[PDB]
Amino acid sequence: MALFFWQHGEEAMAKALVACKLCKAMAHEASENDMVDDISQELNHNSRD
Amino acid sequence: ITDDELKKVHDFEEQCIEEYFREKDDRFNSSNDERIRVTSERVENMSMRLEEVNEREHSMKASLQTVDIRL
Amino acid sequence: ISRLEELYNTRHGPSNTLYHLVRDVKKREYPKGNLPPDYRISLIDIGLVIEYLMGGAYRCNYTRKRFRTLYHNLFEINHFPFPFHELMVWAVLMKRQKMALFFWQHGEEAMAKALVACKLCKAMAHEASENDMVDDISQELNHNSRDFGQLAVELLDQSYKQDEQLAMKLLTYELKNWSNATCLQLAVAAKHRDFIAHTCSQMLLTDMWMGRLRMRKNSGLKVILGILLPPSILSLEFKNKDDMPYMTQALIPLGRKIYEFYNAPIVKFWFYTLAYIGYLMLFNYIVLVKMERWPSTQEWIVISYIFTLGIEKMREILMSEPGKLLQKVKVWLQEYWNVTDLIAILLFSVGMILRLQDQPFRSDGRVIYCVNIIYWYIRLLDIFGVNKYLGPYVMMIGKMMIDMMYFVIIMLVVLMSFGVARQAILFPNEEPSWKLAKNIFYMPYWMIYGEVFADQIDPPCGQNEIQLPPCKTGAWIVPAIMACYLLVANILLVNLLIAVFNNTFFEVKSISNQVWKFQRYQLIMTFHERPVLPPPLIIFSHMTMIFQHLCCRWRGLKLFITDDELKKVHDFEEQCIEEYFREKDDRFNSSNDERIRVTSERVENMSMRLEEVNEREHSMKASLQTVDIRL
Amino acid sequence: VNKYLGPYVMMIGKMMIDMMYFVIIMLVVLMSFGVARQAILFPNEEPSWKLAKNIFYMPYWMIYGEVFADQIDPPCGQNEIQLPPCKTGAWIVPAIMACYLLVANILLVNLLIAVFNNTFFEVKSISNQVWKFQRYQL
Numbered sequence A: 001m002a003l004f005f006w007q008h009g010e011e012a013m014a015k016a017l018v019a020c021k022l023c024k025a026m027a028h029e030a031s032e033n034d035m036v037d038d039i040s041q042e043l044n045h046n047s048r049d
Numbered sequence B: 001i002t003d004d005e006l007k008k009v010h011d012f013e014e015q016c017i018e019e020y021f022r023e024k025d026d027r028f029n030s031s032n033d034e035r036i037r038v039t040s041e042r043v044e045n046m047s048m049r050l051e052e053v054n055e056r057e058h059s060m061k062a063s064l065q066t067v068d069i070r071l
Numbered sequence C: 001i002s003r004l005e006e007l008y009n010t011r012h013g014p015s016n017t018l019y020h021l022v023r024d025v026k027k028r029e030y031p032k033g034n035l036p037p038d039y040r041i042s043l044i045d046i047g048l049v050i051e052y053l054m055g056g057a058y059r060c061n062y063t064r065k066r067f068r069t070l071y072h073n074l075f076e077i078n079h080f081p082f083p084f085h086e087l088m089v090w091a092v093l094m095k096r097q098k099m100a101l102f103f104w105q106h107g108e109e110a111m112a113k114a115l116v117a118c119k120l121c122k123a124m125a126h127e128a129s130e131n132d133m134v135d136d137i138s139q140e141l142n143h144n145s146r147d148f149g150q151l152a153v154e155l156l157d158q159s160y161k162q163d164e165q166l167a168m169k170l171l172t173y174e175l176k177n178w179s180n181a182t183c184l185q186l187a188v189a190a191k192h193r194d195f196i197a198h199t200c201s202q203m204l205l206t207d208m209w210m211g212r213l214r215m216r217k218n219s220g221l222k223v224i225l226g227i228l229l230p231p232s233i234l235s236l237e238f239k240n241k242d243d244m245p246y247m248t249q250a251l252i253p254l255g256r257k258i259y260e261f262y263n264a265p266i267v268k269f270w271f272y273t274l275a276y277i278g279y280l281m282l283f284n285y286i287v288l289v290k291m292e293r294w295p296s297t298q299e300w301i302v303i304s305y306i307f308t309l310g311i312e313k314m315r316e317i318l319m320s321e322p323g324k325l326l327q328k329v330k331v332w333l334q335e336y337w338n339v340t341d342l343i344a345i346l347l348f349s350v351g352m353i354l355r356l357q358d359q360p361f362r363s364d365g366r367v368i369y370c371v372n373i374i375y376w377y378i379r380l381l382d383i384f385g386v387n388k389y390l391g392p393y394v395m396m397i398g399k400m401m402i403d404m405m406y407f408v409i410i411m412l413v414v415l416m417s418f419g420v421a422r423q424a425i426l427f428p429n430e431e432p433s434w435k436l437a438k439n440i441f442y443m444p445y446w447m448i449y450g451e452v453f454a455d456q457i458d459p460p461c462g463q464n465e466i467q468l469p470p471c472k473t474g475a476w477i478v479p480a481i482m483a484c485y486l487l488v489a490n491i492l493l494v495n496l497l498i499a500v501f502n503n504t505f506f507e508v509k510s511i512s513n514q515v516w517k518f519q520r521y522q523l524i525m526t527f528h529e530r531p532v533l534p535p536p537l538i539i540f541s542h543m544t545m546i547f548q549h550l551c552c553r554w555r556g557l558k559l560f561i562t563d564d565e566l567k568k569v570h571d572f573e574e575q576c577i578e579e580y581f582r583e584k585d586d587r588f589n590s591s592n593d594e595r596i597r598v599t600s601e602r603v604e605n606m607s608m609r610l611e612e613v614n615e616r617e618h619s620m621k622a623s624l625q626t627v628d629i630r631l
Numbered sequence D: 001v002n003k004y005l006g007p008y009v010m011m012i013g014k015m016m017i018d019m020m021y022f023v024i025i026m027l028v029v030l031m032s033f034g035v036a037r038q039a040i041l042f043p044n045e046e047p048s049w050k051l052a053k054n055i056f057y058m059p060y061w062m063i064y065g066e067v068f069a070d071q072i073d074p075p076c077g078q079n080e081i082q083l084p085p086c087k088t089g090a091w092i093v094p095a096i097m098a099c100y101l102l103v104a105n106i107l108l109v110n111l112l113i114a115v116f117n118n119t120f121f122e123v124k125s126i127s128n129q130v131w132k133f134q135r136y137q138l
């Protein structure tokens, strides 16, 4: 859904960089709060995408 | 930058998004794996339509032989 | 039973090494010898064969008293409840790989069957290499072991993909048809390194490590703060009462919190580590400071540590897997650290007995203490082996010693040649004395490490400065051969060992990572079975257990799941097998090679049918032309 | 700020973490040889803080080409001026010296050479990207 919404609308570069920041931040927060490690890996993958 | 240049960079960003998406589509359509898959499938269908063509050609040959026998 | 005995006694099909295994277990059981040619191999002997190959405390269902009673009374009671299991074992034993792979797909408990097959294949490969058979048989058996291991790894991947918790239940549940074992225990008994180093089993081992503590964030430090400060335990977050209870045998909240904390294996390990570090500094204090006639309080604490640790090592020997004590010792000798610990305990006992006497034996006991202090420092590498960076480093050093040994041998040859040449030129009138070997080995060995002994390279002699003693004949060869020795030592051999250590780095690093991830299980289950109290206070837990044993005489961390959950894990295991097989079929059908081949063929046929179509179209065109000419 | 020296400093920064484990194993082996040598060669010492200095002093300089050749195997228990008598078990002091000098100078340093070389390429690429990243911060 995020990749679909990235295509539509303006300011796609800032939207992509903000999404990469948010994904890395929630990956770090999920690793810090002792959640499932697969969630942190998938959030890091979304940040890299 | 101003509203005018904002409109310009928004147009630039949309051209960049369309060019990137359809260049990815061109790369995917020209890869060896997708070409082999599309071919394989196309070939699969061909044979099936040509087997139908062979059966209908046998029927047409039998009809032509019967018409030649009648006349 | 009779049909399976006839299957085990067949002579058709490919060759096998089963007869050698039956001969070896018959020679071991009744020390006879070679079997008669007309020998009918009973399934009891197959049971002993399975027990010998699987090793440890494995007890095949054939050798149990129920099956021997059924055998004595008969040679649906004679029908096997799980026939695919015995068929699988039959196939794996007589080296029919495709039949075993077919029987792996059909039936339940496919994971335990695959791990047992990998164990059996590796064991017969080792036995075929030991008995000097054909090496191709050993290679093919190792290939079959690796194929069954890859099957189990892919099944584990599918179980982790579908549902996590029921996959843990698959990994932990007791296998009644496999000597009451566990899939994890079978993956460790078969030395399956890829199975244990998988991320699911690693986090299972991490969950097993932490006991009943949630924690998992900056771990180790809060464990140490709980150890050193007993009122720091109540601030730690504790897991639920029923969230993952791995056990072996299936006010008050404060006492439950204390009991759950102090029985956690990480807390028990850090207890043992702090007690060990305290013992090491108490050993340092008694060896640096002078020793009186009687031992001090610190020496008494060190002696108490050594002897309680010795009784604890004897406890690890007695509470082991086999039933016969020689096999218990043979199992315990696999861990080399335990053997060197026992040797160090005996050496400290000899040193203490020599120290408690008078001179000149007290100094000898002090010296034996000073040699033991070296090993008790070196044991900190195994203590640090629990770390995810230091453990593989220690394993890597272990691999690198074997590469160093050949350098040591070539080094010894060149060093001994230069030592013999220098001592035999510069000293031409010596007498038979043991100082000649010391003069051979002394100077060249320190020549390696930056000390060339510059005062004695080419000393000025045969001149008056005080008159120097005359020159020994041929002494000028002593510098020149020195030059050669210093080159081959310092620029050739050390640089070659640098290249050896660097080129064997990557493979040894990956193997050290997998072996550390494998022996994490061994660390966890050894430290779960250990008593709560540290080694200096372990005598209390030991008398406690001795009194409990006497009271009982007067009167694997599994899950022990039920028939219902057994049905659930069997359904899960069948979904995993079907998903893995048809995902392999999807991968094979979507590969480029198979698509190109299927196309090529389809095209081949097309042309042939279209050539027939062209000929029939020519015939139809001729018929239409004739019909148009007629009308 | 330089395009050659900056990644070199970042690379040294990465290499310190690889050095730390060598330092730990080095500390264990060095402390064992220091305790053994001080506790054999000095059997009548008193509680004093010089014992730790004698533990840490000689083995650490033994790593860097100074084996202290005058004090490896000093001649004693003989008349030359009469030398003081031999300490008991002093012949173990050279032999364990041999082992310590091997594991220090041919095993551990060569292993750290291999560690630094095998982690060179990835750390070099990461140092290049981190330098190019922190150019903005500069």
Ligand SMILES: CC(C)CCC[C@@H](C)[C@H]1CC[C@H]2[C@@H]3CC=C4C[C@@H](OC(=O)CCC(=O)O)CC[C@]4(C)[C@H]3CC[C@]12C
Pocket (backbone or CB within 6 Å): C274, C275, C277, C278, C281, C282, C285, C298
């Ligand atoms: C679990 C680990 C990380 C910490 C626990 C170990 C320390 C608390 C121990 C180990 C060595 C001990 C020392 C060993 C020897 C001595 C000499 C001892 O002095 C004497 O016996 C003579 C002088 C006097 O009686 O005061 C005083 C205690 C002290 C410093 C000890 C203090 C406590 C130490 C530091």
Ligand SMILES: CC(C)CCC[C@@H](C)[C@H]1CC[C@H]2[C@@H]3CC=C4C[C@@H](OC(=O)CCC(=O)O)CC[C@]4(C)[C@H]3CC[C@]12C
Pocket (backbone or CB within 6 Å): C274, C275, C276, C277, C278, C279, C282, C297, C298, C301, C536
């Ligand atoms: C279990 C061990 C390995 C680690 C935990 C540390 C403490 C529980 C122990 C170990 C060393 C012990 C010390 C060793 C030596 C001494 C010297 C001792 O001094 C005397 O006995 C001198 C006076 C006299 O002669 O009566 C007093 C106890 C003390 C400080 C001990 C206090 C308790 C310590 C710190």
Ligand SMILES: CC(C)CCC[C@@H](C)[C@H]1CC[C@H]2[C@@H]3CC=C4C[C@@H](OC(=O)CCC(=O)O)CC[C@]4(C)[C@H]3CC[C@]12C
Pocket (backbone or CB within 6 Å): C334, C335, C336, C337, C374, C378, C381, C394, C395, C397, C398, C399, C401, D029, D032, D033, D036, D096, D097, D099, D100, D103
């Ligand atoms: C103070 C002087 C005498 C120097 C002491 C040198 C040796 C007594 C030490 C130094 C480094 C040690 C090695 C460091 C690493 C390892 C790997 C480790 O091996 C394993 O973990 C595999 C064995 C197993 O656990 O089954 C322990 C043995 C070994 C070779 C050690 C053997 C003893 C060594 C050679």
Ligand SMILES: CC(C)CCC[C@@H](C)[C@H]1CC[C@H]2[C@@H]3CC=C4C[C@@H](OC(=O)CCC(=O)O)CC[C@]4(C)[C@H]3CC[C@]12C
Pocket (backbone or CB within 6 Å): C408, C411, C412, C415, C438, C441, C442, C445, D073, D075, D076, D090, D091, D092, D094, D095, D098, D102
């Ligand atoms: C990598 C390979 C080639 C290493 C091989 C070296 C060792 C076999 C040599 C090198 C230095 C030798 C030691 C040098 C000096 C001594 C002291 C010597 O002590 C005595 O003779 C007692 C009286 C005295 O000290 O004068 C006993 C032999 C020993 C330990 C030697 C034993 C053999 C050693 C360890």
Ligand SMILES: CC(C)CCC[C@@H](C)[C@H]1CC[C@H]2[C@@H]3CC=C4C[C@@H](OC(=O)CCC(=O)O)CC[C@]4(C)[C@H]3CC[C@]12C
Pocket (backbone or CB within 6 Å): C432, C433, C434, C436, C437, C440
């Ligand atoms: C070929 C390589 C692999 C090994 C070479 C080993 C040498 C270093 C050994 C083997 C024979 C040894 C000799 C065999 C016999 C003796 C007599 C022995 O005489 C005594 O002990 C007499 C009483 C005394 O003075 O103690 C002194 C050592 C010596 C010269 C040995 C010195 C060391 C030698 C030359």
Ligand SMILES: CC(C)CCC[C@@H](C)[C@H]1CC[C@H]2[C@@H]3CC=C4C[C@@H](OC(=O)CCC(=O)O)CC[C@]4(C)[C@H]3CC[C@]12C
Pocket (backbone or CB within 6 Å): C408, C409, C412, C434, C435, C437, C438, C441
């Ligand atoms: C694979 C490598 C590491 C094996 C190396 C083995 C040998 C090279 C070592 C092991 C035992 C050593 C011996 C142990 C004890 C002695 C007694 C020592 O005797 C003296 O020094 C006599 C007193 C004196 O006059 O100094 C001479 C060296 C020698 C033969 C050593 C020579 C070197 C030896 C044969």
Ligand SMILES: CC(C)CCC[C@@H](C)[C@H]1CC[C@H]2[C@@H]3CC=C4C[C@@H](OC(=O)CCC(=O)O)CC[C@]4(C)[C@H]3CC[C@]12C
Pocket (backbone or CB within 6 Å): C458, C460, C461, C475, C476, C477, C479, C480, C481, C483, C487
């Ligand atoms: C890797 C390359 C660069 C090595 C080249 C080094 C050699 C060519 C040199 C280094 C040390 C030299 C030796 C140093 C000392 C002497 C003793 C010297 O003896 C005498 O003059 C006899 C009387 C006396 O000893 O005073 C004869 C030459 C020689 C063997 C030299 C020969 C040439 C050597 C072997």
Ligand SMILES: CC(C)CCC[C@@H](C)[C@H]1CC[C@H]2[C@@H]3CC=C4C[C@@H](OC(=O)CCC(=O)O)CC[C@]4(C)[C@H]3CC[C@]12C
Pocket (backbone or CB within 6 Å): D009, D010, D012, D013, D014, D016
């Ligand atoms: C004169 C004697 C006391 C020797 C001095 C040794 C140390 C004080 C120096 C020598 C090399 C230095 C290191 C060289 C390179 C780096 C990388 C550099 O790290 C970074 O750029 C990352 C940190 C950041 O900027 O966020 C600065 C720290 C460090 C580890 C340095 C830390 C301090 C070290 C160990």
Ligand SMILES: CC(C)CCC[C@@H](C)[C@H]1CC[C@H]2[C@@H]3CC=C4C[C@@H](OC(=O)CCC(=O)O)CC[C@]4(C)[C@H]3CC[C@]12C
Pocket (backbone or CB within 6 Å): D023, D026, D027, D030, D053, D056, D057, D060
């Ligand atoms: C890679 C790892 C294993 C390195 C570990 C080595 C250090 C922990 C050691 C090695 C040399 C030691 C030093 C050697 C000598 C001294 C002088 C000493 O000074 C005094 O005692 C003052 C009076 C005097 O100088 O006599 C104080 C300790 C110190 C700095 C020592 C502190 C600890 C050091 C730095």
Ligand SMILES: CC(C)CCC[C@@H](C)[C@H]1CC[C@H]2[C@@H]3CC=C4C[C@@H](OC(=O)CCC(=O)O)CC[C@]4(C)[C@H]3CC[C@]12C
Pocket (backbone or CB within 6 Å): C277, C280, C281, C284, C285, C288, D047, D048, D049, D051, D052, D055
């Ligand atoms: C196990 C490894 C990781 C660490 C080992 C550390 C040792 C090198 C330490 C720990 C205990 C220390 C001892 C603890 C107590 C004392 C008493 C202390 O006595 C005094 O200070 C008395 C007054 C004076 O003479 O200054 C002298 C140092 C000493 C022997 C310490 C020397 C250094 C020791 C052996």
Ligand SMILES: CC(C)CCC[C@@H](C)[C@H]1CC[C@H]2[C@@H]3CC=C4C[C@@H](OC(=O)CCC(=O)O)CC[C@]4(C)[C@H]3CC[C@]12C
Pocket (backbone or CB within 6 Å): D023, D024, D027, D049, D050, D052, D053, D056
């Ligand atoms: C990861 C690595 C680098 C950590 C290394 C830490 C220790 C090995 C160092 C850090 C602080 C050092 C201590 C700092 C100061 C001293 C006092 C010093 O005291 C004296 O020399 C007393 C005066 C004299 O009689 O010489 C003895 C060494 C010692 C204990 C040092 C021993 C080595 C220590 C414990």
Ligand SMILES: CCC1(c2ccccc2)C(=O)NCNC1=O
Pocket (backbone or CB within 6 Å): C269, C272, C273, C275, C276, C309, C312, C341, C382, C383, C535
């Ligand atoms: C002596 C070392 C140790 C130990 C401690 C921590 C980790 C591993 C081993 C112990 O203190 N007692 C039981 N077993 C042992 O060998």
